[PDB]
């Protein structure tokens, strides 16, 4: 659900690990829509980390995950592996795709 | 209950049929017919005749399965422990969940719900059953035969009445979702009010109205709606026939409107009762004002 | 009504009409979505207050005895068993149920328990509304003239009815013969002279109403076109579920084409303005709907 | 009907024609979203917008709190994928009716065209349908309107030509989807994300090659890099058929070459049997936009490389459907 | 006048008397320099505390008004009365815009949540209810108190509400999910009044009670509870522990609150005295012979140096702080 | 509903709050706690033993 | 303060079945009390014009009513020869002091709040005790019907106006008429003294010279049926200024709370506000369709009430 | 003093078992729930 995926995202952001989510379309459509927000926040935090004007001596890059400020390591990434040909699997919302 | 009722032949037949079931052990009813036909009123009246106490669950928006379980516990405690004859009138609109149907199925068939009482509730039930068995003159100590006596008391005392509208697909689905609803319940098809019933209600209600026209000319091609209308009809008979025709016209109107694809509202006997009440009141008011 | 009404007015005009009719009786507007609906219902039942309840698609089955009038009369009281507690039903109590959804489906028991009053938009009413709106927009002096004329006609007809009723009452209440008391003759003469003056006022208001009508005949085709356009828009739901358009949508289109129209910036001729208004009405209706 | 061919002007409609009490329902066919349009609109108006993705209970809580804050503070609120909560949509419609919001408050409900969306909500708000643009000309117009002017007009003068070529390629590829078995093998999700990725790739590689110089040689443009990336990752990523990949490679090698900078380059060949589409000679955004706006109204599948009869059965079916629709509301 | 150290002084500024019945509660307008006092004569009189002149009476309640509160903007006034109703007042036009029924008995408290979109009220039917400001619908019902709930107060951010009852306990609820966060039962009598600690007092409370700095940096919300056992207790909502007990009142404590600077505690009781507490040393600094009868309520202005106390002698007094 | 109750030699000690008028006002006007039920007292009530 | 009544009204209270005789303001509460000729005293809420209650203990027409400093007691006089003291907490008559032969015209509680004065047709003014109810000392010297009686601000001086054209100021301690004034053209009906807020305003209004003590001295005023309002010096007994212009007999006179303007009623069916320091304000304001009987000025609120023979009490806004 | 007043409601059918149940209620409230209770009872309530 939203809470479990958010906690996993917090762990991956803090560790700096790659998150491969296989069979990502087995989530409910509403849960995929909700998770899109956290994915977008993490991606924006990563993007604002990559600008040249950022300096490591300044405050570290953080993102709002589960109503908390979580440091986002530059090494993390989100990968989703899906089989779209299986009938009954959820359809990812356009904002998530 | 202070609601007037117009009595016709079908009402007497139906109250006799209902009274037959209430006098039998484990006698449950399944009344099927249009809403507003008097199923609940007739059931309450007959329960009053036989000394049964009418119980209805007070469903609302926040009603859930636990509230239904508590209501079932109350009904079973009153019927079995207190040796009270209870008519449990329950409507299809009271079924907010399939768990309701599961509990109803088990209660209708076996006479008790095995898991309804547990923990503190089970202990209180056993104490009340021991008191009731002492009152009845039986000496029962262990929980097994106490529960058996409670089940026998519930079977002998509790009567469940089910009222629902005649939906073909709904009936087919209920034939499988609640199998005991069709094996442990006597099915009475009240249906809609017939043409004869409508004519009798119109004749009885508009009796106090004058509706007398000595110089009324019977048309050559009389628009007969009620089959048993007398061949040389009077003015009052023609008026009641016109009322019945109005009701049937609304039925055909909804049929045609639904055929095209529009949204229709069900026409019930309460519509006919409002029609005749409005006719009487308007007749009296217009006559008084003109005089 | 015998059964308590269930009003269906998407525009909400029937709701305000009900609130205005029963304002002097202290009508309370509540809803089924309120957790405190039971308390308001019991207060209305006990004290006999008119009640208007919205969101009837969330109907609370606690109203079943109230709608069915399952009262028990004992000791001179009228007992209604609202749930588990008895309440003395005051005879002045009345409840109106309302909804803004014309497409909502109701269970057959609720359909049996209430009198359905449906407030739909007719072609004639929409034509009248559009004609009045264009008259106010283009000819405001004529619009206020027509409003004053309607008020005057209503007052004059009420006065005529009162005078006729008072004349009948005076002729019926005499304790003897008319010429026995002079006051009866005084009253009759006063009533007749008032009736004559009001009839003259009615005639002059009638001729000015005739001129008001004959100046408004030019805008009738626009109102007919507006009614046709709206009833075409309303029927767009037959080819797709997404084409749901309310009356306020068309009314906003009309307001935009009347008052917020760039093509009326420097045009002063009435016929030219009317032609521009019609053309831009069609254009704006297509642009907004499509 | 000429207004319908132009890109939707959300700024004017939101500013003037939409009351704060009316939600802005933006229904979109699958493969399209209106979230980006509203975020761009809020960015250009310097208006704060709260975007919430519907689907969680705490999501509903944040939606309620954001609406309550915005109706007083006059900010904008986005609720995306609201078609996944029809009952909460009915509750929201009931909440919106009894409300007196700020003059600048706007509520945008982003859903897809779903039959489960409540009818009362559809009547309450103003609906905007987002779908594939009707033709090639409209598709290029939308592409040019979406891309900021300052983004195209950068230091290299050849960036505008590359952007026009990319817009033409996107329009040709996306219009071929209307002919499902002929244009492609299946309905691919060629959309704004692919166009944005391609634009970013063009910018990155042009900046890497042209080190801020005002002009670059046509042969010095990294044609191979753009072609390979757009055939392997950006547009060819969704392609899972070898023949669809072959068609995409054919289009890329026909369009993205140094010959595209010639004055006599042909975008399409023999569209009506005699005439053919011609490469504009302009070097700035405005010239290309004017050329797009001067495109003929008449469009045939030969613009896409398809045979002219590829649309005959579809047009006949659409005509019959129009007759049926007219006869269904008489 | 140190901007966070003034305390009220014996010589009163004004003694406003227009009420015909004991004054139940007195509050300050957050924005304007005007004052509102509720009394048992079903009237809500409005006073100016700079010049001490009566302005207007807000009537419409049938029975005694028990509580009054302002929203953050000061544009709405919510009042609850003994006639089981809650009225919302448009303080610009001074008309009652909405009346809310639903409580089964005397409604003895009312509070507008900090966001300003909901109204929380406590009543004698042992329940706490939440009302939408816009629609007036009851949306939540906090059950669990075993006796008449006397007060309800939301915290600074509105995520928590505290309540006190005749059941001698103080309960802290969670607004979002209705759960009872804590049950503070250490008073030996009925709890009359409660008050939340401002963020300006968190450090002072922590260093006065000796509480070590938590790793979070948030000491945890602090609450007060005046009760009829003549004592005031300071609680830690996060842990549920009573940080200190303030002894010195000679009768039932009726109202309690912090100095806006978070350095002292102001409380009033039925001993006819208004007391200033130095909770640093857990002792009472100043005692004011406020009124000639029971003192029912007090308020302390957020910015201006003014204290107001209502009393059963039907008199509202304004105190200059120096 | 004025009431007359005979056979007072078998007095039922439930009328004690009623006979002592142990009521409290407000929150429903006159409230009487007859046993465990908070009955609402009608001013027109009178009982004769 | 420049509070001045305006021609528009807010409430015209009409519950009395007989002409209203006097209207007063409660010292602290938002309560207005009207005594009428139907032997009843009615209580009103002048802020919203709502009838509150009636005190129907009197036998004959009630003439004059008066509160004390605390407003907890109400003293009333009537034509039934009695003085009734009302407990304003419970609104029940607590003490009915008898005597004082024939119609009693006026009543007043001096600020000390323990004794009462009263005037009547029997050509004397009596002195009662609130606590006990015995008339301890009786004032004699008026040869005719004494109409109105008014004490000072500290319970030491008393003035009484009568039909004998004399306005005699009396002393509590010595019971001697130290100032006797017989100079009016016709019957003197109403009197009202000067608040300390206006003592300074009389110096430049008249030009009087301060004595060795420097105080201007206690001040007087007496309205009369001769359509003339005259203000008098209690210390000396000489005239300051005569206010002329009333159409009919004047029935009530009192000073503005700010001590700047003169505001009074009369039988001319109109209310007239007069300035005396500069003779600038001469506003004439009709109030009732019939004779106007009495009036009062709120100490702090911007309200004035008037009672009239038309059985109606009206409240005017001060602006 | 904050005590909760408890009075037994006797009647014609009030027997020893009912009194024992009332005692159990009072003792539970005052010993398990830490509630101060003033158990007021009259000599007429002593039916046995
Ligand atoms: N025979 C009858 N004559 C007159 N009214 C009737 C009759 N039967 C039913 N009604 C009306 O129907 C109402 C009750 O209907 P009910 O029995 O609840 O319908 P259902 O059978 O759907 O439960 C009553 O208010 C009564 O006025």
Curated annotation (Swiss-Prot), chain F:
State its location(s).
Answer: Cytoplasm, Cytoskeleton
Q: What does this protein do?
A: Cytoplasmic dynein 1 acts as a motor for the intracellular retrograde motility of vesicles and organelles along microtubules. Dynein has ATPase activity; the force-producing power stroke is thought to occur on release of ADP. Plays a role in mitotic spindle assembly and metaphase plate congression.
Family affiliation: Belongs to the dynein heavy chain family.
Q: What is known of its domains?
A: Dynein heavy chains probably consist of an N-terminal stem (which binds cargo and interacts with other dynein components), and the head or motor domain. The motor contains six tandemly-linked AAA domains in the head, which form a ring. A stalk-like structure (formed by two of the coiled coil domains) protrudes between AAA 4 and AAA 5 and terminates in a microtubule-binding site. A seventh domain may also contribute to this ring; it is not clear whether the N-terminus or the C-terminus forms this extra domain.
In its UniProt record, what illness is this protein linked to? Charcot-Marie-Tooth disease, axonal, type 2O: An axonal form of Charcot-Marie-Tooth disease, a disorder of the peripheral nervous system, characterized by progressive weakness and atrophy, initially of the peroneal muscles and later of the distal muscles of the arms. Charcot-Marie-Tooth disease is classified in two main groups on the basis of electrophysiologic properties and histopathology: primary peripheral demyelinating neuropathies (designated CMT1 when they are dominantly inherited) and primary peripheral axonal neuropathies (CMT2). Cortical dysplasia, complex, with other brain malformations 13: An autosomal dominant disorder characterized by global developmental delay with impaired intellectual development. Some patients show signs of peripheral neuropathy, such as abnormal gait and hyporeflexia. CDCBM13 is associated with variable neuronal migration defects resulting in cortical malformations.
Q: How does it assemble?
A: Homodimer. The cytoplasmic dynein 1 complex consists of two catalytic heavy chains (HCs) and a number of non-catalytic subunits presented by intermediate chains (ICs), light intermediate chains (LICs) and light chains (LCs); the composition seems to vary in respect to the IC, LIC and LC composition. The heavy chain homodimer serves as a scaffold for the probable homodimeric assembly of the respective non-catalytic subunits. The ICs and LICs bind directly to the HC dimer and dynein LCs assemble on the IC dimer. Interacts with DYNC1LI1; DYNC1LI1 and DYNC1LI2 bind mutually exclusive to DYNC1H1.
Q: What is the protein's name according to its record?
A: Cytoplasmic dynein 1 heavy chain 1
This chain's source organism reads: Homo sapiens (Human)
The full protein's residues present here are 3631 to 3679 of 4646
From Swiss-Prot, chain G:
Main localization is: cytoplasm
Tissues with expression = Fairly ubiquitous expression in both the frontal and occipital areas of the brain.
Where in this protein does the record say Phosphoserine is found?
18
GO annotation, biological process: acrosome assembly; actin cytoskeleton organization; adult locomotory behavior; ameboidal-type cell migration; auditory receptor cell development; brain morphogenesis; cerebral cortex development; cerebral cortex neuron differentiation
Superkingdom assignment: Eukaryota
Q: Which residues cross the membrane?
A: none
Q: What does this protein do?
A: Regulatory subunit (beta subunit) of the cytosolic type I platelet-activating factor (PAF) acetylhydrolase (PAF-AH (I)), an enzyme that catalyzes the hydrolyze of the acetyl group at the sn-2 position of PAF and its analogs and participates in PAF inactivation. Regulates the PAF-AH (I) activity in a catalytic dimer composition-dependent manner. Required for proper activation of Rho GTPases and actin polymerization at the leading edge of locomoting cerebellar neurons and postmigratory hippocampal neurons in response to calcium influx triggered via NMDA receptors.
The entry describes its oligomerization and partners as:
Component of the cytosolic PAF-AH (I) heterotetrameric enzyme, which is composed of PAFAH1B1 (beta), PAFAH1B2 (alpha2) and PAFAH1B3 (alpha1) subunits. The catalytic activity of the enzyme resides in the alpha1 (PAFAH1B3) and alpha2 (PAFAH1B2) subunits, whereas the beta subunit (PAFAH1B1) has regulatory activity. Trimer formation is not essential for the catalytic activity.
Similarity remark? Belongs to the WD repeat LIS1/nudF family.
Give the linked disease: Lissencephaly 1: A classical lissencephaly. It is characterized by agyria or pachygyria and disorganization of the clear neuronal lamination of normal six-layered cortex. The cortex is abnormally thick and poorly organized with 4 primitive layers. Associated with enlarged and dysmorphic ventricles and often hypoplasia of the corpus callosum.
Q: What is this protein called?
A: Platelet-activating factor acetylhydrolase IB subunit beta
UniProt source species: Homo sapiens (Human)
